[PDB]
Symmetry: D2
Subunit: 461 residues, 4 copies
């Protein structure tokens, strides 16, 4: 006999699957009882979560609004059309000049779909080098020639780099490399670059060598929506993005593309190629709950409160970096123009691994990161998540104080036990000074609110 629908299908998670329910409750507590400084993370709204967890997951709607493969899409079409128009509005795009596809499962599929749309297999691509702050999906191969990224497997990638002494993108070397290599596509945007991007200069390079210009704005898209950084839309042909980082939405991807007349009576040709690449070439039915949740996030992204948030994210990153530099610490480029700071630890004789591990033991989550394109010598620290919990400059200065204490302990351990990781680990065991800072972190962390769920009804307090 089948289970009644009420038994299997309407009973809440806490009863159907206590194991998973309990783990989710623990992850909820982890998220609000520490200091989350991963620049690729945020805390989204309950409203987004409610649309994400909804009956929209049940609808399979291959195709797009007005050109579907089956019926019953009267409401899924409206949700997607709303999501698309809200996406153009969030980034201040004229609909006759820009279109957007909101079906990519995530930012990385969005990139590969864009490539598939406008390139043939083995076409040449250039993107920011991983040690310089770029992303895997912009191309990555090892010194041994092992192709790591699919972008480097199915296309021919060549990375460009930051200047090794200033940490800024070396635009002259960019242009020289693009004239030698002749990429069909240049990617800009990155994961760990602490400055704004000169899209105008990327456009001059792309025109000089004949390339398409794509910006992957996954990391700064929220700042782009609030017009707090340079807009890639002013100079790029295509803009891709993940939607959960500084944009504060669900996990999802978008591809924006130029429409209308080119600046021969020529018109852009991207719309149909982009749509076709997403479906039917790469994806099946879109994840409609993601599209609903995204539409919610894009409306929230259009509000004066979100512009104030993006402003605060920048101000918090600046205040944290100033606090660190005021303690003698070295930031790559000596500051920031966006949501993150990149902390160079080689002046301290430390590696990013050591600091990341010790911070993680105090519930301060950062990530080790390569520096000046040259074990990784730094850590990357992001302001979006904690700003979303309402922290302002004074709070980030206190975060800077916790980081200051954390690196001081990391140096105390390295001096007492050794410079090799095997040595360093010896000092983490039952370290009373780590325990103290972990307590101070948790106390501080628990003084702020938390979007996405009510701290008052969580299982673990």
């Amino acid at each position: 006999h089948m289970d009644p629908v009420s038994v299997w299908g309407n009973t809440p998670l806490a009863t159907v699957d206590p194991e998973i329910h309990d783990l989710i409750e623990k992850e909820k507590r982890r998220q609000c009882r520490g200091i989350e400084l991963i620049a690729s993370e945020n805390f989204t709204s309950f409203a987004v979560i409610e649309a994400l967890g909804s009956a929209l997951t049940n609808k399979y709607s291959e195709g797009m609004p007005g050109n579907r493969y089956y019926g019953g899409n009267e409401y899924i079409d409206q949700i997607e059309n709303l999501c698309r128009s809200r996406a153009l509005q969030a980034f201040h795009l004229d609909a006759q000049s820009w279109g957007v596809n909101v079906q990519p499962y995530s930012g990385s599929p969005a990139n590969f779909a864009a490539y598939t749309a406008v390139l043939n297999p083995h076409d040449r691509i250039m993107g920011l080098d991983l040690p310089s702050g770029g992303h895997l999906t912009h191309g990555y191969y090892t010194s041994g020639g092992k192709k790591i990224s699919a972008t480097s497997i199915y296309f021919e990638s060549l990375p460009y780099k930051v200047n090794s002494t200033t940490g800024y993108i070396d635009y002259d070397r960019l242009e020289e490399k693009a004239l030698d290599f002749r990429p069909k596509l240049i990617i800009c945007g990155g994961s760990a670059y602490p400055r704004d991007w000169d899209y105008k200069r990327f456009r001059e390079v792309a025109d000089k060598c004949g390339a398409l210009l794509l910006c992957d704005m996954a990391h700064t898209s929220g700042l782009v929506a609030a017009q707090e950084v340079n807009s890639p839309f002013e100079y790029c042909d295509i803009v891709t993005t993940t939607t959960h980082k500084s944009l504060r939405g669900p996990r999802a991807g978008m591809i924006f593309y130029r429409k209308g007349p080119k600046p021969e009576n020529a018109v852009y040709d991207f719309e149909d190629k982009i749509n076709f690449a997403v479906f039917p070439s790469l994806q099946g039915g879109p994840h409609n709950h993601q599209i609903g949740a995204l539409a919610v996030a894009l409306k929230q992204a259009a509000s004066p409160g979100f512009k104030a948030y993006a402003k605060q994210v920048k101000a918090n990153a600046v205040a944290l970096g100033k606090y660190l530099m005021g303690k003698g610490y070295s930031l790559v480029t000596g500051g920031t123009e966006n949501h993150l700071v990149l902390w160079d630890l080689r002046p301290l004789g430390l590696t990013g691994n050591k600091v990341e591990k010790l911070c993680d033991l105090c519930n301060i989550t950062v990530n080790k990161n390569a520096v000046f394109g040259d074990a990784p010598g730094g850590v990357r620290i992001g302001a979006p998540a904690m700003t979303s919990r309402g922290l302002v400059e004074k709070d980030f200065e206190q975060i800077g104080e916790f980081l200051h204490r954390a690196v001081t302990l990391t140096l105390e351990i390295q001096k007492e036990h050794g410079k090799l990781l095997k040595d360093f680990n010896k000092g983490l065991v039952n370290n009373k000074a780590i325990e103290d800072l972990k307590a101070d972190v948790e106390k501080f962390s628990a003084l702020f609110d938390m979007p996405g769920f009510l701290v008052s009804e969580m299982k673990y307090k």
Copy 2:
């Protein structure tokens, strides 16, 4: 200006933050329970799955996998993913020493493409079931004009195999002959609109004869596989991929199963590391951890005795439906079904699937037009999973058969009165009292059954 308080933007419910979207979801909830949903690639998943899907797990970015993450804070995500992996093996009765699984694919299409990336080089040869024969886009597709449509046919070299044009069964002899000529590195089995079970043993003999890897995409039947109601692809295939929302009744997600341990030179399987590396770092970023959580929930449900009875009932409902249709004189491809769907050939009626799909759509009966016998699409594909999840049994699917009978009867009457051109046919859809009577009988029939995933008593629109 100042920042919104967290309570305002971050804790306020959807109905207040975004009434527009809230209202559209409420309307979609009503649409899902006011009609008869017969799309074979759709199901209604559980509220428990949905609760895990809509959770703070969305906030955690955990590039890598348990034990080899790129950053910390992963203590609970690792446990959830490990549980998802172990429950995936349990649900399909797999020995952890012989099988591994990766649960990070965003969906079934990325699961396929990551599997290809793992075991093939660009332009390696692939064979899969032809689309007119019931196959899927991600198994390879190019048009008679030579346009490469599927990315699988863009980055690899595909060649389809077909069903026998008279019996509708997979032509295993032509499959073997094509494979020996083309020499694929990878043969794919599994499909979208095939109404019979698969002879994996025979696929394995072909693969071994031509030196190919053998992958099954069980997206459509994976629920029936978990319940051991259809043949197991795992008995013969190197790799098995799946989507998790169709007959498996889970969230939107994908998995890749791969063999491990000794090959039956003392050589052992080499899939595990290649598969994992292809999913990440090669193709994806951080996994969608809320999907992994929701999938872990669905996989525990799929291991329950109730789910096994559900799978039996899906098959029984599809059989009882096909038998009711053939009792009315209708033609099914292969004359029946061994799985969750029936493929109805309308060409003997002088109809196209489009016309039947449109009139059904107007009575809130959702089917999809579909090519038949590999040869405008001349059929409709009808699936049993979703309505079986609302508790319908054989008698209910016979009444569904009667609604389909009435629907196609009206379709013929319209075609006869107005003509075969769609412009003509449309005329018979306007103020049609017999469509209204069917629409009403459908909605009344539909409202007799429960609905998983949300509470009907709380719906905005009843």
Copy 3:
């Protein structure tokens, strides 16, 4: 001190390099003291040899007439232009409808240059299967998927086959495969097919699936020039050829291509692509001595004597095959329409290797060859070379008698020593019956003239 020009540069070979001179003299004797039945071999004229061995080898002339990269080409241009116009005339082509490039080093580079001209890497190609009588450059991969031919390495090949019971090309299976595989290019022509080609049917297939149609006529080009077989030019877009087989010229290649209006006011687009593929994409400076020698061969190919020769080649192959069949032997397709016969030995319980080896010991040169597309079960026998020495039907009937004797001995050895090759070899050692037939072969062979050199002044007699 440098050698005087007279010493190193004008002294004849016999004095500069006695080793090589002596070996060439031995090869000359080998060529006229046996029976040469390799269908891919001929004996060219002394006139061709004189142009081949000439000061034309010294001129490097990259480009083509009227569009060269350096000076001094006043006479090389005239030679090449003459070679091209003589090539169109030899095959009865209108210059407004056909062009030809005569720079390919050989037939195989001619094929790859044609492919490069009209295909992109990994485009699909179909050609006659090697076991069915096709050529390596039409595509070849092993059962294990090892890509053997460059055509199968840089493009995607799929072979079509002869009917396994009739030995004729299976045109229905050809069309079905072309509709499944959708090649961009279909190749016709082959190495060991004993019948004419239905180019009209290949054209219907290519049109139905949208492919270009190329004929590689290397083997029958001489018969094509004499209009003794079907002309590929009537239905193919491109025709390639080697120039030394039945055409009786030097070692070289040619690519013919359609010009002018298509049968949208559309015109063919092959000329510039073909020329560019040959140079600068693939070759350097052409081998001008080859082009001079080829022009000589093409004039000879246009003469009534050459038409009589091509007629005689066919009549000799027919007479030889009739003689063999009259002894109970089995030919694939039961006869021939061209220069060769394909002898099926499986009815005798023999392999082609065994017969080839024993014939080679009697100075009868054939080659083992696969049969009905299914160790190779047959031998391929060609009439061009011995016909060029003036042999007619009665002489080829006597060749058939020598072959009859040779296979009889091969069966006597297989019966006395065993069916395995290790066994069979035991019977070749100091076999008096082989010795006798070798003497009869040589006596017969030495009764006929020899083009290319004067038998009367050769070193070895």
Copy 4:
């Protein structure tokens, strides 16, 4: 009709069978000895080479190689090819245990492409000397507009390296940097218009640093390499390819040298089988055995003491020529030469190579325009091999320098009188008594020297 007797079509000499072609060859023979031939990729080979080239060896089709032929009758072809191979190793002082060679490439361009096919997969990365910097098409070439011109850039992925734009020497630091960025699987050295020796040791350090194979195309200097007059590529390269008709003075043919034996894991080199298989069956058919015979002859000549003195003289002549030009105020790229050629930069004169090439061509002085400093071509390339083969020594090349001096002096005068547009420049070439006087002085100078390959006393046209 009947067949022509063998005596008529087959034994009659060319002058009777084809008077047209016979006459054109006689005219080309005269052209070759009535002027000054300064094309660096041309030579005059020996009558012995020509005798072997024009022989019955053309008739033998011998697919495969000695010891592994596809059919019989190969007893003497095998011996000739083995001798050609052993003499190829002897001429370049190679130990048969450390080096093998394949002598079947139809020419140097097929030798290169077969080598690539042997050691690379389609689309593997290759680096070679940029064409404006003195490189060759087969080392990779694509235009600023992105059009892939060389097949090497069509089937593989190429990236050129360049000379230093101010010194004209290979920029080894940028080479290393580009190689570490691009990560080629194959780095090519050797070139067409580079006037200095190559630092193979440095190429080897770069190759080792980036994990590349290292191939030298010594087509231009192979004669000087045989005579140990320039650096040996064999000391540092995995593979060495060459054409055989330039400084080596042989027939038109190609060879591929490859390392064998232990790598300096007890691993050994793996090139031999791959190279052979790439030449045949992969890319070519039967070898051109008359070329192999003629090449065996040239390789015995290249091992003679006279050939070593010839190579010394080529270098001395090119030096004496460049010194004479620079003494007249002219500019050479790098200020001199270490090999067989000089690269004359005409941009300081306000001239293009085209104008100088055309006026020289009108005085029966054959040079070729050529790009310079990697930046209309602003130079001419002048080679010493061919005229050195006619016995010219330093004094003769100084007189050639004087003819070039007079030629470019006239070129400037024409440009000054008529203008810089080629339409203008052409006007000064008509009934020019000073061009005639130079043409006459050139032909008179030219007729003082012998000519290899044929007898001047037998020429149709004296």
